[PDB]
Design a protein around this ligand. Structure first.
Ligand code: ZN
Ligand code: ZN
Ligand code: ZN
Ligand code: ZN
Lengths: 67, 1114, 46, 216, 48
């Protein structure tokens, strides 16, 4: 629902990177791996979750009980 | 930017599915229903007056839904998702304009509401129709739910599209013994009717029609059919020379030995054996006794007035049984799709509705009749409100029908049941997955061999992957991803148009015409068989592909059976594909830049003559290409892409062409059983059962299919790294095994939601069922068992609830069901309180509850309970490639390898699955996975497509992993090099239903069922397990005496019968009853099922008197 | 608020009497849900 | 009701925990029972007119869209009315109309006599007098007493318009209530003051409508 | 086989039909309300 703070393999902290990643993709559109590669992701299992994990919370906050 | 002639095609299919939706089938036919059909339906019966009241009539005029002439769409109506919680039917009022007669010079009309219509989501009249993402939001229901399913009484279900055998067509079944029955069954409105014809004995060939009695000689028939020649009869059905002459002519011989011509006797002998006229209106008993219905019984397809038409229809029909009786083969086998037709929900609601409405108004005669009985004053006040008291029985009866699934139609004299299923949300794929489904029925016994397997003709116009293990009494089949089910167009314009091509009529035919060309058949009905087969097909197709009669109404030939068939029957399977125009495609590859530009759209290719929808029969005539790369100037078409051949679920398998198909089958049956996000509405909907996954992820491999349905926005599964290896011998067969400090890190976790509603209704004593609660003894706390709340007296958010506690406290009056009297004084309490208790192994949570009202104004409480399940030992994990396996013994961390960067696999899986299950597709998928991350991309794969393998090699080696997709690892325990390179990397997995914690079931001593006095049924209620006979007798091969007794007796039904040596019978306590002594009794133990069986017998007159004898003294 | 609960759509704090009716006030909309307890609650994350 | 054979505890506690589903008292520890044995899955002039009487009853009942449950009230009343021979002497529509009216009134629902009756040719004073007779023949009390506070809703639902009416409704009710307070209420048709405060607070919300619509 | 026990070939046509014992005619749970779910054979003979 929100990027797991650690991966399922390394468990290196992912959390900081998602925002910084996503921004780094939107601002200054750049190659994915290279982004991560110069964002500091090396291990591919670490990497998959930034290349993956569609965020469902932002598509949820469309729906909320309170509005 | 010019485009590949190959790769350009790929933008067609989306635009095809863009405008015209994936599920249109229901959608259109429902819209097409509510729009067109009813205006025809009432146009059938708009007029009623009982026999009375010399000047009256009631004339229906308009039917509308939502438009009473305030707004266009309904001014306001309940929101569907909101109704899902109110647990109502979700419906729309029926606006009906009717002009009646009441009193002197009136003839007056209005709009009326006869009832409400249980509409279908995302229809035209649906609120959701063309509503942009805020109306989704503000209306609180998902964008990505395809809709196309009804909702009633708080549930939803679907109308399952049911395939029915092709109707109104001559079909010959060739069966040994017998004599090869011909049958044609046809229906128009009234009288859906079967008809048969066949030999009985040795060339002597008769009509079996349940209308008539039985066994009517066909030559006599065709005589009565108006052709009297007896020469062109033979010449007609036969041919020119060959041997066919006498082969048929035997009947003609012993035909003659009875009677001749057609004054009376031809028609008469028919009517001679016809059944009764049902008393009155028998006056048609004549020399023309049946002559009216002689033509029309089961031959309504033509009827009309003179006899030549259907006369020759029967003739050509007879041609197939003589060409049959010539030889086996040379016949038709009820198999290949075109001879069968699925038929959409649109007409289901049509028939069921209009027949309920039918019998309704039929009884509305009576509805005014009671008023009409005594001429009180002058009788008028035309029953305008009086429809209401009669009304909504349509709506109600329509509701209970549409949810229940039992359809009794006694005007059609036919009854289908199990027409619907409870809508399946176990997962996202299932959503459209339970749609796009097809039911087969009838087809003689279930053992009958022919209507069973998957035949090749099925190519690309259904799914060929999915046929789940639920085969059973019938069969389900799934569509393609490019499908068009055809709507019935029209008859006469295309007929007289056929005449415009210069065809001829049976009236102008020589009655020597088994030589001329082939034949023309409209609906499968012969007309002229115009000369010059080919150019005919050319001209008309050219009409179709250019200016007219779009969709189907296509055409195909047959050389052997001599015909060219061109009928306009809907409910017919269709599909696009690219015409090759002479040498090559009509596309011409530049026109697609004129497509991708954004201004082309679709349906143009029809009107600009590029591509069109076709038929299995049509393509049986055509010759199709595969790649524009490989074509022949003699070709006809190419279908844009192969991978629409896969089914809606099958589109998930990466590179399926590298598998063996059964693993694709199982893979479909598992996919819909995966667990995932469902829909954006997720936490705002409450369903009787739900699953989801904490951290779903786009599968590293995609299939461009997924890109269509945005399945990447709704993944079910994890993208999980694995190392193929036999490590941790706990693995063995198919049994996967996992990683702690990963499961600890949040791998594969599932919130499991359920709901338990409790209806609150008032009882005739006029005392509500009450929620009272909050005891709080002990000075400040409610007892643990009762400590599951707060002052409200009902469950609340955010509480661990251990089984034995109260997640709703429901107090009902113990006198509630009593008979109230015109009195009360003080206490209307007398409550026997039955709060329901959460039962189960492990705590759940109440995070959400709803107090709300149904339609009848009564208190209704609905709560949802949830618990997250850490993926404990023994959980089904699909590898999404067909590997269906239990989670094995969970490793800690260190154990299982790590290697260079230290990346530790998560799932760790046995190699042995891959050799015998023989599926290399996954084995490629892993390569593609380790690739994509390393280049930083998702990875396409699709049937005969996607990223190929070789490119990945360089893709991998540059970044330093062996192109073979393998690497060293290091011992999870020992810490040395592993003695063989391991293939490992990313693979997308998924978690399933059949979580063990649900499934594990045990009892010590559980309840017994009153009737048989023994353990109850299956899981849930409580336990007991099944020793079947076939299961039992296995113990006898070991010959264990006592194991039977302890098992089938001492632990089964523990009972002692008391009997009487003299006249052995079973008494009770100390009596032998019928012989009343209270002495000779012997007490002994017996299975209570035994004594049961006895009394059951001795209930019926019978006496298995039990005589006894000692165990001891030898 | 520390009062009882909320609408479905209107989404506003609302109480109720005993045996009165479920219809909300702010909105004529019928269904409504229950606010989460002000009471403490505890898990253990692992 | 049952008592232990030994401790003789008067209270028994059922254990569903382990799925033995047994019964034993906190006084002994000696069970009450093992495996509670559970289950699963004509023509008379009166009775026939009870068939037809249910037919009429239910049909004309939810012609109003009244709750199904409430109908069974009158069904007993109707049956109760059969006992005193109040039923035979007059028309059936009188009967069913009466017994339904006594239900809805007694149950305090929103429906109106002049309205409900209007399903027929009827002068509506007729069946009113029918209902008046069973007041004698059956024996009743203060039970059937209503106020517009109900009927404004069913009226408010029928006029569509906008949702400010609800705001208006709150405005109207207490309005009428003060009118109920100022003592001009009783002795007159409650519907009158209902539509009155309708036009008043809708007038307070300044939406222009007709008295025709109100009395409609 | 006759030897004054059952009753020679007479019995085999019904005269007194024995009522099936009540347990083998289990009355289904009244399942709330006043109308109890019936049981069939008792309906049959109760018409008999
Ligand atoms: Zn990692
Ligand atoms: Zn005896
Ligand atoms: Zn509200
Ligand atoms: Zn005791």
């Amino acid at each position: 629902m929100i990027v797991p703070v650690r991966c399922f393999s390394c468990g290196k902290v992912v959390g900081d990177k998602w925002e910084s990643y996503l921004n780094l993709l939107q601002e200054d559109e750049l190659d994915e791996g290279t982004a991560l590669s110069r964002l500091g992701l090396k291990r591919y299992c670490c990497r998959r979750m930034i290349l993956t994990h569609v965020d469902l919370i932002e598509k949820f906050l469309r729906y909320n009980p309170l509005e | 930017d010019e485009i590949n002639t190959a790769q350009d095609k790929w933008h067609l299919l989306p635009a095809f599915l863009k405008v015209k939706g994936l599920v249109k089938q229901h959608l259109d036919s429902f819209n097409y229903f509510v729009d067109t059909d009813l205006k025809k339906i009432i146009k059938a019966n708009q007029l009623i007056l009982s026999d009375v009241d010399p000047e009256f009539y009631l004339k229906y005029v308009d039917i509308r839904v939502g438009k009473k002439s305030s707004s266009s769409t309904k001014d306001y109506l309940t929101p569907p998702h909101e109704c899902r919680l109110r647990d109502m039917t979700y419906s729309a009022p029926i606006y009906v304009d009717i002009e009646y007669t009441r009193g002197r010079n009136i003839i007056m009309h209005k709009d009326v509401e006869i009832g409400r219509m249980p509409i279908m989501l995302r229809s035209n009249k649906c609120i959701l129709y063309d509503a942009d993402e805020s109306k989704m939001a503000k209306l609180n229901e998902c964008p990505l739910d395809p809709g196309g399913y009804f909702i009633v009484n708080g549930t939803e279900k679907v109308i399952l599209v049911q395939e029915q055998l092709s109707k109104n067509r001559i079909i010959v079944e060739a069966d040994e013994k017998k004599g090869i029955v011909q049958a044609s069954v046809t229906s128009s409105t009234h009288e859906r009717k079967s008809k048969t014809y066949v030999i009985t004995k040795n060339g002597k060939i008769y009509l079996k029609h349940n209308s008539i009695a039985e066994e009517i000689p066909i030559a006599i028939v065709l005589k009565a059919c108006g052709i009297l020649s007896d020469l062109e009869i033979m010449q007609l059905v036969c041919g020119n020379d060959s041997s066919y002459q006498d082969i048929f002519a035997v009947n003609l011989e012993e035909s003659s030995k009875l009677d001749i011509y057609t004054q009376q006797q031809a028609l008469e002998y028919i009517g001679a054996k016809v059944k009764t006229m049902r008393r009155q209106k028998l006056t048609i008993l004549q020399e023309g006794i049946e002559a009216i219905a002689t033509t029309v019984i089961a031959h309504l397809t033509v009827e009309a007035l003179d006899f030549r038409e259907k006369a020759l229809y029967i003739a050509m029909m007879t041609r197939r049984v003589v060409m049959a009786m010539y030889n086996p083969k040379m016949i038709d086998d009820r198999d290949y799709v075109g001879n069968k037709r699925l038929e959409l929900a649109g007409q289901l609601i049509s028939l069921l509705f209009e027949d309920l409405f039918k019998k309704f108004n039929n009884d509305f005669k009576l509805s005014i009749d009671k008023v009409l009985k005594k001429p009180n004053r002058a009788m008028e006040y035309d029953a305008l409100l009086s429809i209401n008291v009669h009304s909504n029985n349509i709506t109600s009866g329509l509701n209970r029908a549409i949810s229940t699934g039992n359809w009794s139609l006694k005007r059609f004299k036919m009854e289908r049941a199990g027409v619907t299923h409870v809508l399946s949300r176990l997962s996202y794929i299932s959503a459209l997955g339970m749609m796009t489904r097809i039911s087969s029925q009838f087809e003689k016994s279930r053992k009958v061999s022919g209507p069973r397997a998957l035949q090749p003709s099925q190519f690309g116009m259904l799914c060929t992957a999915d046929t789940p293990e639920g085969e059973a009494c019938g069969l389900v089949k799934n569509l393609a991803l490019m499908t068009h089910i055809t709507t019935d167009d029209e008859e006469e314009p295309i007929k007289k148009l056929c005449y415009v091509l210069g065809v001829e009529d049976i009236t102008l035919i020589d009655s020597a015409s088994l030589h001329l060309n082939y034949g023309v058949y409209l609906n499968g009905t012969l007309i002229g068989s115009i000369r010059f087969p080919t150019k005919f097909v050319t001209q008309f197709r050219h009409l179709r592909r250019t200016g007219k009669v779009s969709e189907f109404i296509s055409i195909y030939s047959n050389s052997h059976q001599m015909a060219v068939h061109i009928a306009t029957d809907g409910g017919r399977i269709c599909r696009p594909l690219i015409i090759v125009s002479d040498g090559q495609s009509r596309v011409k590859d530049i026109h697609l830049r004129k497509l991708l530009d954004g201004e082309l759209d679709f349906d143009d290719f029809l009107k600009l003559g590029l591509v069109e929808y076709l038929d299995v029969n049509e393509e049986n005539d055509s010759y199709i290409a595969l790649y524009e790369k490989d074509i022949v100037p003699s070709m006809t078409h190419l279908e844009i892409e192969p991978f629409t051949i896969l089914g809606a679920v099958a589109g998930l398998i990466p590179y399926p062409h590298h598998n063996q198909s059964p693993r694709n089958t199982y893979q479909c049956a598992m996919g819909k059983q995966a667990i995932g996000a469902i829909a954006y509405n997720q936490f705002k909907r409450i369903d009787t059962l739900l699953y989801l996954m904490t951290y779903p992820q786009q599968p590293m491999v995609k299939t461009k299919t997924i890109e269509l349905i945005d399945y990447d926005k709704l993944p079910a599964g994890q993208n999980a790294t694995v190392a193929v290896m036999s490590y941790s011998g706990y693995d063995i067969e198919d049994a996967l095994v996992l990683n702690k400090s990963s499961i600890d890190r949040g791998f594969g976790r599932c919130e499991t939601r359920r709901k338990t509603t409790t209806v609150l209704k008032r009882y005739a004593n006029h005392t509500q069922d009450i929620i009272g609660g909050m005891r709080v003894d002990e000075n400040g706390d409610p007892i643990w068992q009762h400590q599951s709340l707060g002052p409200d007296g009902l469950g609340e958010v955010g509480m661990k609830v251990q089984s034995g506690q109260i997640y709703i406290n429901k107090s009902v009056p113990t006198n509630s069901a009593d008979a109230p009297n015109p009195n009360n004084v003080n206490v209307q309490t007398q409550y026997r309180e039955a709060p329901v208790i959460y039962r189960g192994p492990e705590p759940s949570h109440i995070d959400q509850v709803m107090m709300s009202v149904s339609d009848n104004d009564q208190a209704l409480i609905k709560v949802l309970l949830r618990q997250n399940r850490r993926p404990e030992l023994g959980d089904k994990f699909s590898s999404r490639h067909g590997q269906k396996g239990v989670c094995g013994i969970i490793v800690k961390q260190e154990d299982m390898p790590f290697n260079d960067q230290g990346i530790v696999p998560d799932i760790i899986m046995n190699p042995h699955g891959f050799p015998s299950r023989m599926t290399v597709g996954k084995m490629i998928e892993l390569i593609s996975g380790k690739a994509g991350v390393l280049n930083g991309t998702l990875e396409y794969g699709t049937c005969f497509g996607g990223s190929k393998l070789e490119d990945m090699s360089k893709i991998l080696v540059d970044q330093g992993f062996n192109y073979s997709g393998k690497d060293m690892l290091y011992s999870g325990i020992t810490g040395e090099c592993l003695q063989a390179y391991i293939f490992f990397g990313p693979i997308y997995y998924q978690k399933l239903k059949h979580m063990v914690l649900d499934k594990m079931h045990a009892r010590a001593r559980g309840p017994r069922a009153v009737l048989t006095r023994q353990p109850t049924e299956g899981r849930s209620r409580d336990g007991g397990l099944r020793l079947g006979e076939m299961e039992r007798d296995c113990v006898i091969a070991y010959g264990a005496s006592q194991l039977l007794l302890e098992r089938l007796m001492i632990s089964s039904d523990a009972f002692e019968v008391d009997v009487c040596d003299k006249c052995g019978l079973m008494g009770y306590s100390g009596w032998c009853t019928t012989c009343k002594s209270a002495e000779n009794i012997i007490k002994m133990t017996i299975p209570y099922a035994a004594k049961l069986l006895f009394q059951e017998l001795l209930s019926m007159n019978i006496a298995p008197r039990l005589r006894l004898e000692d165990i001891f003294q030898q | 608020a520390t009062l009882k609960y909320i609408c479905a759509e209107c989404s506003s704090k609302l109480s109720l009497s005993r045996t009165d009716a479920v219809r909300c006030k702010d909105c004529g909309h019928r269904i409504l849900l229950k606010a989460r307890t002000k009471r403490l609650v505890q898990f253990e994350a692992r | 009701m049952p008592v232990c054979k030994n401790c003789h505890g008067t209270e028994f506690e059922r254990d569903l925990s382990n799925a033995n589903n047994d019964l034993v008292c906190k006084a002994c520890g000696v069970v009450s029972e093992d495996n509670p044995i559970v289950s699963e899955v004509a023509l008379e002039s009166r009775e026939a007119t009870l068939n037809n009487a249910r037919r009429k009853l239910r049909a004309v009942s939810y012609a109003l869209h009244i709750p199904e449950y409430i109908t069974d009230a009158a069904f007993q009343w109707y049956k109760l009315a059969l006992a005193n021979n109040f039923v035979q002497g007059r028309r059936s529509q009188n009967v069913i109309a009466s017994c339904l009216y006594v239900a809805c009134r007694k149950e305090k629902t929103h429906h109106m006599l002049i309205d409900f009756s209007s399903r027929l040719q009827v002068s509506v004073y007729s069946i009113g007098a029918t209902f008046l007779k069973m007041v004698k023949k059956l024996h009743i009390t203060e039970l059937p007493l209503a106020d517009p506070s109900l009927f404004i809703q069913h009226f408010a639902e029928k006029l569509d318009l906008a949702d400010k009416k609800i705001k208006v409704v709150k405005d109207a009710v207490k309005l009428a209530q003060r009118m109920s307070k100022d003592w001009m209420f009783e002795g007159r048709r409650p519907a009158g003051i209902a539509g009155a405060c309708i036009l008043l607070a809708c007038r307070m919300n300044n939406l222009r409508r007709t008295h025709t619509e109100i009395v409609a | 086989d006759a030897t004054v026990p059952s009753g020679r070939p007479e019995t085999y046509i019904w005269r007194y039909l024995p009522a099936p014992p009540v347990c083998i005619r289990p009355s289904v749970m009244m399942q709330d309300s006043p109308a109890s779910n019936e049981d069939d054979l008792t309906v049959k003979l109760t018409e008999i």
